[PDB]
C-alpha cells in the first residue's frame, strides 16, 4: 500500500508491492528495508527525483545497510533497481534543514 | 508488477514488460493510469535485430499517432497519457530478442 515515509523510518516493510512517499517533512535520516519472500527479488523505481543536491541524497543498498551500495543520488527520472536477493534498503539523508524534497518510491516483488 | 504476456491493457504504478516468448509475432500493450497523472515510459539499452524486429510507441490506442519505431537506443524516454500503447513486432521465423520496457505513473508524492 502507500507508506508514509516519515512514519516508517527504521522499520522493515513486508508488502508485496506498494509505494513510499518521502514527503516534504522527512527526518534528517530515514531508512526503509524492504523484505520479500525468500524466493523473490525486489524491484524498485523512482519516477522523478530532484533533491537539493549538496544537502540531500538517497542511497540504495543491495540487501541490508551493510550490503553493496548502488550509490548516492540526488536527481533523475525512471531510476530503477533490482536486488540480488529478497531484501533491499533505501536510505534518505539530509545534511541540515527542516524541509524535505518530496519523491515517490514504487516497489514490488519479482519472482523469476 | 512484471508482465510476460503478449499485450493487454495494463494498469500499474510501476510495470516491467519482458520478452513475450510465445508464437505470436506482434504484441500490443495499452497502458492505463489515473488520468490525473501522466505515464513515463522507459526503454533503456534496447538491442533488437534491426530489420527483423522493432518496438513502436503510439500516442494512444492502436491506429493512433506513431511516435517512433526502434531496434536500438541507449535510452528512450517518453511521457504520455493513459491509453498510450507500446507495440512489439517481429518477422515470422525470427526468435524474439530480449527486451524490457518500463512504465511508471509519473508523480512526486
Amino acid at each position: 500500500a502507500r507508506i508514509n515515509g516519515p512514519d516508517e523510518c527504521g522499520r522493515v516493510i513486508k508488502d508485496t508491492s506498494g509505494s513510499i512517499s518521502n514527503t516534504d517533512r522527512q527526518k534528517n535520516l530515514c531508512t526503509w528495508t524492504i523484505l520479500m519472500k525468500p524466493d523473490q527479488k525486489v524491484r524498485m523505481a523512482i519516477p522523478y527525483l530532484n533533491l537539493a543536491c549538496g544537502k540531500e541524497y538517497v542511497e540504495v543498498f543491495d540487501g541490508l545497510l551493510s550490503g553493496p551500495s548502488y550509490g548516492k543520488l540526488c536527481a533523475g527520472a525512471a531510476i530503477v533497481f533490482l536486488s540480488t536477493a529478497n531484501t533491499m534498503t533505501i536510505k534518505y539523508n539530509r545534511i541540515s534543514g527542516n524541509s524535505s524534497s518530496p519523491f515517490l518510491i514504487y516497489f514490488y516483488g519479482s519472482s523469476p | 508488477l512484471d508482465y510476460h504476456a503478449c499485450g493487454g491493457r495494463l494498469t500499474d504504478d510501476y510495470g516491467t514488460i519482458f520478452t513475450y516468448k510465445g508464437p505470436k509475432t506482434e504484441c500490443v500493450w495499452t497502458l492505463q493510469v489515473d488520468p490525473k497523472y501522466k505515464l513515463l515510459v522507459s526503454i533503456p539499452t534496447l538491442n533488437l535485430t534491426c530489420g527483423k524486429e522493432y518496438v513502436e510507441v503510439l500516442e494512444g490506442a492502436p491506429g493512433s499517432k506513431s511516435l517512433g519505431k526502434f531496434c536500438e537506443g541507449l535510452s528512450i524516454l517518453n511521457r504520455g497519457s493513459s491509453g498510450m500503447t507500446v507495440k512489439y513486432k517481429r518477422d515470422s521465423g525470427h526468435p524474439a530478442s530480449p527486451y524490457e520496457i518500463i512504465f511508471l505513473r509519473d508523480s512526486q508524492g
Side-chain angles (χ1 to χ4, degrees), chain A residues 1-54 56-97 100-110 112, chain B:
Chain A
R2 231 237 299 141
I3 287 87
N4 192 67
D7 298 352
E8 242 67 30
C9 305
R11 303 185 190 165
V12 346
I13 291 84
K14 284 163 134 298
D15 289 279
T16 36
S17 68
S19 61
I20 299 169
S21 184
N22 192 56
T23 288
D24 61 354
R25 137 263 158 166
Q26 183 60 70
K27 292 172 178 48
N28 280 75
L29 171 63
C30 187
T31 287
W32 304 285
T33 165
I34 303 164
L35 221 203
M36 295 282 171
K37 284 172 287 193
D39 52 286
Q40 298 181 115
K41 299 179 85 183
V42 188
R43 298 196 87 102
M44 184 246 297
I46 301 178
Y48 181 72
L49 184 73
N50 187 32
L51 303 182
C53 226
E56 305 167 291
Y57 76 74
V58 173
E59 190 173 3
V60 182
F61 300 84
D62 180 29
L64 274 26
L65 265 172
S66 46
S69 170
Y70 288 115
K72 303 185 170 58
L73 312 84
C74 80
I79 305 171
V80 172
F81 296 102
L82 171 66
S83 58
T84 47
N86 66 320
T87 193
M88 185 181 261
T89 306
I90 301 150
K91 171 190 172 178
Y92 164 86
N93 189 211
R94 187 208 314 134
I95 287 176
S96 86
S100 224
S101 293
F103 60 90
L104 256 192
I105 287 174
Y106 296 124
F107 72 92
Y108 68 78
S110 178
Chain B
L1 279 25
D2 295 338
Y3 301 88
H4 301 271
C6 182
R9 294 193 67 88
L10 316 181
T11 303
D12 199 334
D13 279 347
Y14 168 22
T16 305
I17 296 165
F18 296 93
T19 303
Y20 153 79
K21 299 195 178 188
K24 299 198 192 63
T25 53
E26 178 178 288
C27 302
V28 315
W29 297 268
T30 293
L31 320 171
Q32 306 179 53
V33 72
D34 175 352
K36 183 197 293 284
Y37 300 97
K38 289 284 166 283
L39 276 177
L40 194 54
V41 176
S42 177
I43 305 177
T45 60
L46 181 71
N47 190 25
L48 308 184
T49 296
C50 293
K52 294 231 81 180
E53 54 184 327
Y54 68 82
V55 170
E56 168 172 24
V57 178
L58 302 171
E59 187 187 53
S64 63
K65 186 182 65 185
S66 179
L67 275 41
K69 280 194 186 175
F70 358 70
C71 46
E72 288 187 29
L74 177 56
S75 169
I76 295 148
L77 193 54
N78 254 102
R79 163 126 65 252
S81 316
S82 195
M84 145 177 269
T85 101
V86 176
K87 172 188 174 184
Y88 167 85
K89 235 283 277 305
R90 65 176 220 268
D91 283 348
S92 283
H94 183 70
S97 289
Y99 52 81
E100 169 174 332
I101 298 139
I102 305 162
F103 62 96
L104 301 150
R105 174 169 56 95
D106 191 24
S107 188
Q108 265 198 296

